[PDB]
From Swiss-Prot, chain A:
This is 26S proteasome non-ATPase regulatory subunit 7. One of its GO terms (molecular function) is protein homodimerization activity. One of its GO terms (biological process) is proteasome-mediated ubiquitin-dependent protein catabolic process. The modification N6-acetyllysine is found at K200, K210. Residues 5-140 form the MPN domain. It comes from Homo sapiens. Does not bind a metal ion. There is a cross-link at K176 (Glycyl lysine isopeptide (Lys-Gly) (interchain with G-Cter in ubiquitin)). InterPro entries: EIF3F/CSN6-like_C, JAMM/MPN+_dom, MPN, MPN_RPN7_8. Pfam families: JAB, MitMem_reg. It comes from the Eukaryota.
Curated annotation (Swiss-Prot), chain C:
Component of the 19S proteasome regulatory particle complex. The 26S proteasome consists of a 20S core particle (CP) and two 19S regulatory subunits (RP). The regulatory particle is made of a lid composed of 9 subunits including PSMD11, a base containing 6 ATPases and few additional components. This is 26S proteasome non-ATPase regulatory subunit 11. It is found in: Nucleus; Cytoplasm, Cytosol. Highly expressed in embryonic stem cells (ESCs). Expression decreases as ESCs differentiate. Component of the 26S proteasome, a multiprotein complex involved in the ATP-dependent degradation of ubiquitinated proteins. This complex plays a key role in the maintenance of protein homeostasis by removing misfolded or damaged proteins, which could impair cellular functions, and by removing proteins whose functions are no longer required. Therefore, the proteasome participates in numerous cellular processes, including cell cycle progression, apoptosis, or DNA damage repair. In the complex, PSMD11 is required for proteasome assembly. It comes from Homo sapiens. Disulfide bonds: none annotated. Belongs to the proteasome subunit S9 family. Phosphorylated by AMPK. Induction: By FOXO4; expression in embryonic stem cells (ESCs) is mediated by FOXO4.
From Swiss-Prot, chain D:
Component of the 26S proteasome, a multiprotein complex involved in the ATP-dependent degradation of ubiquitinated proteins. This complex plays a key role in the maintenance of protein homeostasis by removing misfolded or damaged proteins, which could impair cellular functions, and by removing proteins whose functions are no longer required. Therefore, the proteasome participates in numerous cellular processes, including cell cycle progression, apoptosis, or DNA damage repair. Transmembrane segments: none annotated. The modification N6-acetyllysine is found at K16. This is 26S proteasome non-ATPase regulatory subunit 13. It comes from the Eukaryota. It comes from Homo sapiens. The lineage of its organism: Eukaryota, Metazoa, Chordata, Craniata, Vertebrata. Component of the 19S proteasome regulatory particle complex. The 26S proteasome consists of a 20S core particle (CP) and two 19S regulatory subunits (RP). The regulatory particle is made of a lid composed of 9 subunits including PSMD13, a base containing 6 ATPases and few additional components.
Curated annotation (Swiss-Prot), chain E:
Belongs to the proteasome subunit S14 family. This is 26S proteasome non-ATPase regulatory subunit 8. The gene is PSMD8. Component of the 26S proteasome, a multiprotein complex involved in the ATP-dependent degradation of ubiquitinated proteins. This complex plays a key role in the maintenance of protein homeostasis by removing misfolded or damaged proteins, which could impair cellular functions, and by removing proteins whose functions are no longer required. Therefore, the proteasome participates in numerous cellular processes, including cell cycle progression, apoptosis, or DNA damage repair. There is a cross-link at K63 (Glycyl lysine isopeptide (Lys-Gly) (interchain with G-Cter in SUMO2)). Component of the 19S proteasome regulatory particle complex. The 26S proteasome consists of a 20S core particle (CP) and two 19S regulatory subunits (RP). The regulatory particle is made of a lid composed of 9 subunits including PSMD8, a base containing 6 ATPases and few additional components. Interacts with DDI2. Interacts with TASOR.
Length: 286, 91, 53, 94, 116
């Protein structure tokens, strides 16, 4: 239904400052706010946000509040001050997918049809992309309940823009990994993404904690993929997968062998370009 | 038979057509000069085969396909487990 | 002039059917390709030998 | 039941495991490929079949132990081959 | 003559000892040739009957052949030396390159980008 989402770094930042402004409560508060944006060409866009007053008490945690007058007038100001801008859905600060977010989405779907949510990070530590988004799908289906509804993650990335790329690249001024040569790939995804595969091997190790001791629902629809992964584990090293591998090493290295051969001759022509400027000035200048 | 078989004998195919083995060869002749079914028949061992090129490059190419299908699947389960622990032990 | 140009056209159409019937397969007998052209075997074999040369 | 090493059974084994003759198992497996319950290929002269994909089934609390231990030594293999990269290309980027 | 394969011209020189006895030296030269043919019976041979390789060293028919036939293989059978020319287990190694070359490829990039 939706291809992907596009998040600007402003709305990425426009939650953190509110997380600072309610950080004096100390005890517990999740930041929940209205997400504004304009989805076009089946691509979800996210532009602007604010945060709505929201509290939560732990005993009987089914009692939420959205001050809709604050939602009515401030969006009416925002529809005034940017008529290109509209509602796109909502968000919450999302540490660990709290329970009220099954009907918050159903509370305010009378504005946005595909009222998408966004889970963000306030304490960043990962090896992935710390912005997560779901979508609302419902089912009268296989086994669980007559009324069943579960969120599904549509893929997420941080979109840039020519206005804000001026800003963020001025705001970094920090340790950087520019000059992409032979080394940026080695550290953006060869040092890093191999350890990125750690926390996904270890993630399914964490579901594996129920062998005879963990939580009481057992499998039914979790193991059809896990049965496939050991089935779609790749081909063993006996076939011409051995032979055609040596074939292309015997082709890819020849281009490197030519290209390195050129590198020696070019700097040797540079060597004479310094022996023309060494000997032809010691008699001239002194 | 081109789709689901790899290497069938000449006698076996003529038996599922209930006609002569030479009449079978005239059928596979005017279809691959029509090149609408590819086949590489034999008239000494009776060993024909279907969709069998030399395959220099498609081995590692289809192998690289199986990595990306695998890596797209290991990302599917990971963000599906972490919600499943949040519907039993949330608060 | 046709009585001059038919013999040169016959050679071109000889090898044009000769790649046609030889196309669909692998190793094969020489006794069938003479049987599928209605032509002899010694002259065909020399004419086959000219192709790979 | 067979591992991912071969999973290449013969027609005579089906003639044992299903007590049906040789001239009907090809008619059987063409049905199995058509329905979509199995995905593989069929040889006829070497009398073997290269099954590749099978339909996923369910399993009890014992086959997860197979997926427990076969997954567990795949952890250290991701550890071991990466440990070269943070050691050999360490000065290339700090 | 011991350097090349020639063995019979070596023992033609054991018919030609001109100067003194040379006894203890050629008898050690027997022993270092005994294991050498027992070394060179182990090449890729076919069946040899109990006459041909029985006489390639010197011997007519003592039990010394069983002292070699039970030392190495080529099993004592019905006038036969059985050939264990398998040489099948070692090939098809992608892994031994894939450990070593992944070292070498980063070693290429060390003296390629980082100034030394």
């Amino acid at each position: 239904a939706v291809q992907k989402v596009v998040v600007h770094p402003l709305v990425l930042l426009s939650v953190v400052d509110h997380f600072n402004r309610i950080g004096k409560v100390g005890n517990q508060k999740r930041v929940v706010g209205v997400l504004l944006g304009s989805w076009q060409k089946k691509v979800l866009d996210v532009s602007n946000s604010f945060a709505v007053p929201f509290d939560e008490d732990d005993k009987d945690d089914s009692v939420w509040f959205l001050d809709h007058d604050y939602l009515e007038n401030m969006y009416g100001m925002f529809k005034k001050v940017n008529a290109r801008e509209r509602i796109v859905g909502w968000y919450h600060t999302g540490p660990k997918l709290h329970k009220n977010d099954i009907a918050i989405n159903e509370l305010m779907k009378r504005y946005c049809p595909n009222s998408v949510l966004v889970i963000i990070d306030v304490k960043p530590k990962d090896l992935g992309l710390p912005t997560e988004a779901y979508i609302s799908v419902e089912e009268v289906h296989d086994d669980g309940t007559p009324t069943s509804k579960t969120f599904e993650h549509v893929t997420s990335e941080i979109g840039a823009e020519e206005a804000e790329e001026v800003g963020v690249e001025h705001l970094l001024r920090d340790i950087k990994d520019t000059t992409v040569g032979t080394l940026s790939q080695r550290i953006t995804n060869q040092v890093h993404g191999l350890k990125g595969l750690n926390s996904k091997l270890l993630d399914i190790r964490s579901y594996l904690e129920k062998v005879a001791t963990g939580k009481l629902p057992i499998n039914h629809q979790i193991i059809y993929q896990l049965q496939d992964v050991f089935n779609l584990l790749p081909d063993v090293s006996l076939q011409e997968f051995v032979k055609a591998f040596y074939l292309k090493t015997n082709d890819q290295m020849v281009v490197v062998y030519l290209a390195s051969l050129i590198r020696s001759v070019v700097a040797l022509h540079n060597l004479i370009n310094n022996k023309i400027a060494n000997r032809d000035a010691e008699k001239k200048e002194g | 038979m081109a789709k689901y078989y790899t290497r069938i004998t000449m006698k076996r195919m003529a038996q599922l057509l209930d006609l002569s083995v030479d009449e079978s060869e005239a059928f596979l002749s005017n279809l691959v000069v029509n090149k609408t079914i590819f086949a590489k028949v034999d008239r000494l061992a009776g060993i024909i085969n279907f969709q069998r090129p030399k395959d220099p490059n498609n081995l590692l190419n289809d192998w690289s396909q199986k990595l990306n299908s695998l890596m797209s699947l290991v990302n599917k389960t990971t963000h599906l487990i972490a919600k499943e622990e949040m519907i039993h032990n949330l608060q | 002039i046709i009585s001059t140009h038919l013999a040169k056209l016959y050679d071109n159409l000889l090898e044009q059917n000769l790649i046609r019937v030889i196309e669909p397969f692998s190793r094969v007998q020489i006794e069938h390709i003479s049987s599928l052209i209605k032509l002899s075997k010694a002259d065909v074999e020399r004419k086959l030998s000219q192709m790979i040369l | 039941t067979r591992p991912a090493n071969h999973r290449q059974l013969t027609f005579e084994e089906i003639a044992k495991s299903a007590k049906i003759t040789v001239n009907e198992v090809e008619l059987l497996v063409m049905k199995a490929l058509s329905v979509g319950l199995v995905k593989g290929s069929i040889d006829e002269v070497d009398k073997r079949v290269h099954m590749t994909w099978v339909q996923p089934r369910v399993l009890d609390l014992q086959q997860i132990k197979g997926m427990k231990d076969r997954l567990e030594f795949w952890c250290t293999d991701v550890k071991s081959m990466e440990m070269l990269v943070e050691h050999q290309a360490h000065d290339i980027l700090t | 003559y011991l350097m090349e394969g020639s063995y019979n011209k070596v023992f033609l020189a054991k018919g030609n000892i001109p100067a003194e006895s040379y006894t203890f030296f050629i008898d050690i030269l027997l022993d270092t040739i005994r294991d050498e043919i027992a070394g060179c019976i182990e090449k890729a041979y076919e069946k040899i009957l109990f006459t041909e390789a029985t006489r390639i060293l010197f011997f007519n028919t003592p039990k010394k052949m069983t002292d070699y036939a039970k030392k190495r293989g080529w099993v004592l059978g019905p006038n036969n030396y059985y050939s264990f020319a398998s040489q099948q287990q070692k090939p098809e190694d992608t892994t031994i390159p894939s450990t070593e070359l992944a070292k070498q490829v980063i070693e290429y990039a060390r003296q390629l980008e980082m100034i030394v």
